[PDB]
Write a structure and sequence with these properties.
The chain is α+β, with helices and mostly antiparallel strands. The chain has helices at residues 43-50, 58-65, 84-93, 115-118, 136-139, 141-144, 176-193, 234-237, 247-257, 291-296, 300-310, 312-320, 345-353, 361-369, 409-424, 492-498, 501-514, and strands spanning 5-6, 12-25, 72-73, 98-107, 120-123, 130-134, 169-172, 197-204, 210-216, 265-267, 270-273, 276-279, 288-290, 377-378, 383-387, 394-397, 402-404, 444-445, 465-472, 479-486. It is built from 17 helices and 20 strands. The strands form 6 sheets. Strands 1, 2, 3, 4, 7, 15 and 16 form a 7-stranded mixed β-sheet that branches. One of its GO terms (biological process) is cell wall organization.
Amino acid sequence: MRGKIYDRNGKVLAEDVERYKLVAVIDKKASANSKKPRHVVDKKETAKKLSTVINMKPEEIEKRLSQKKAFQIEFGRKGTNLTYQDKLKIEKMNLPGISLLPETERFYPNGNFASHLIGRAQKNPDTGELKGALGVEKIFDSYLSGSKGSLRYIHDIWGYIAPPKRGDDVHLTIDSNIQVFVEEALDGMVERYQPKDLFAVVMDAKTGEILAYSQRPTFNPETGKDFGKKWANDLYQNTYEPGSTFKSYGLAAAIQEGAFDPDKKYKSGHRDIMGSRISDWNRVGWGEIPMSLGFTYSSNTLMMHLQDLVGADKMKSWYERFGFGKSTKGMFDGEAPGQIGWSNELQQKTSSFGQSTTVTPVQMLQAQSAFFNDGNMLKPWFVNSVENPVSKRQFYKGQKQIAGKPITKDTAEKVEKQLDLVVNSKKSHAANYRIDGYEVEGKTGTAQVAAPNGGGYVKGPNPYFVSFMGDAPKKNPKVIVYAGMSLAQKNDQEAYELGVSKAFKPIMENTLKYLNVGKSK
């Protein structure tokens, strides 16, 4: 047995099962040393009796019993992965030459479910040996695998090298109930906007536990549907120019450095940098306004203004101190570090509002956490324990760590106030993320997308990556929800206007409802 992959409530996400394969001996040579024939005598009548399972076409079953001049025959994919009920029925029939060989197959009960995180195990036809090829299944292959007994090693995680054999179980921080809300909501987005890429993550605000995560396009682990298109896990391996989501950190930096004042006015509109008219999102601005409104209205100028006030060399340090351009050191394989765009003044200024600079969605979760844990960035973790369930030996146990405290408690509270405005201001550009009976806050995140291999940015009507980095209930939140959609292909206007609001509202509402947080109607 390969070990199981459980969720945080010990519901099975992956396991081994025994399923059966249909073989028929069709050659008289078998029956040439026996009274009782070990070969299909009546091809016709055996075929009709067999036509109670799978492709029940007696003609096609007969054709294959007549086939070639081979000793045995199999029945493609339809003659494999047959249940124990499917077997007992064909064994009662007691047909001559018909048998069912047991093969162990890797079963994912929910099918397409956190498919890019859990991952998928492939089988060696020869030995029937399962080897994980992506996600948990690849990372913890050795621990899960009941076979070998060489040295046990964790894929990229230097350390944890421990030296009829069952395997070790891997428990995740996932909560199937929540992971549902996400999977449904994401399906909702693919129907509506059919984006080229999409993801959502739920994190415990207080722990850094990943409660739920899917992406699109994903694959189905059970079937191998679409497996090996997008290899990259969005949350851990994929880099983004994150957009307005990333102002939150630029803001904090300023607040602390003393350069930001909610009431102090600044000139909104444009800023000619390196001979480029970098402008607010409405191209004109709103003239002289308070910096509080600028954040509520996602002003690119404000961020550029604040960069000037604080200073470049000082801000690069700030972005570094929020853990950008550096791995989260999470338990996933080949995690992406990203890079802070600072090679020149353009990169620098654009960065302020979240372009040039590249992030993992997790780098961002880490950073946003600080605003709710008194300035402390929580390391996000999805792996709860690796532990053989015979012995109960915990090989790895996960826990809340602290990746840094780049800001004061005070600073954090002020950033929170500004996020509360972004959503619940009178002049809010983002009341589309509001929810009945629950108090929400967060940051809207419209952003251009790079041309994969060279060129500049992707062109189109609305060629945008839209995100939102929300958390509820506001001030003392239980969960963070970060959703992102890249290059909607349908409704590409509604995309620019609503953003990921149509995904965030359901996920958050259902999650809070499920964690039994009270609704002040």
